[PDB]
Design a protein around this ligand. Structure first.
Ligand SMILES: COCCc1nnc(N)o1
Ligand SMILES: [Mg+2]
Lengths: 151, 151
């Protein structure tokens, strides 16, 4: 494996550890991974971090009632670019009616970028992904990790 | 002001805002600013961040019972280098006997470096600074700002 490949594997491990922990605790989270469509316009709406990824930092960002927890984290490769970012809300009718703004924001950004967004529900602890305008819900840990590896 | 001056002032403002928030809520915190003595060996004991400073990120690091709040934040070159770092405990017999490990850690690093460390007490919300082996206690907001600007 090249350094680039090993760095990706470390980032994927950090993300999955954070998501799994938040899911167990019903910590709502919204995490968008930029791909080939640049997300600068959305990154610039948040608080700049440009931080090395760690599971610890991801979890801390989303603790309720803290400055960084509302809005999206946007990751660029192996960095957390910004937190508390705006994303556009989707009007798709295929978003389950009980879901709130984090899921609608995730699907929204997925309609205008090739990004992958992970959502943790504060109601249920369920994990979902938005990509290309579709929301895939109730993901097992294994499924999430495979989706990230394939991404 | 020059660019470097504006950047230093912005960092001081971020620090003081975070410290004020933590003092009000009696959130324990430990924040060491590296100066001429290199602290890489201590930075390496924590979780790497290399992040832009913001009051928001500082607060989100120090949330009680979260991954990153156990240990010191170390700042270097106008960035948060790492969190949850080890600092050496002072053996000085001249620290107020009611103070515990965060304050002893701050004094300890200040005995072997020219760094400036800020401490917020979880017991009282009092703010103190360690430099040169001494602890300056019960600081007002103006006092802490003066110390940061002098530094
Ligand atoms: C070690 O703690 C369990 C996982 C965790 N990491 N960071 C937070 N806040 O939790
Ligand atoms: Mg299903």
């Amino acid at each position: 494996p090249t350094p680039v490949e090993e760095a990706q594997q470390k980032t994927i491990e950090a993300i999955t550890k954070a998501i799994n922990y938040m899911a167990k605790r019903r910590i709502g989270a919204l995490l968008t991974i930029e791909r080939d469509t640049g997300m600068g316009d959305y990154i610039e709406t948040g608080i700049p971090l440009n931080a090395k990824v760690s599971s610890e930092l991801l979890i801390n960002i989303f603790i309720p009632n803290t400055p960084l927890h509302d809005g999206a984290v946007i990751m660029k490769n192996n960095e957390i670019a910004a937190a508390a970012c705006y994303l556009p809300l989707s009007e798709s009718p295929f978003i389950s009616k009980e879901l709130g703004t984090r899921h609608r924001a995730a699907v929204g950004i997925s309609e205008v970028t090739d990004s992958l967004t992970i959502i943790v529900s504060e109601e249920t602890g369920g994990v979902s992904v938005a990509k290309n305008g579709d929301l895939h819900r109730e993901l097992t840990e294994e499924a999430l990790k495979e989706m990230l590896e394939a991404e």
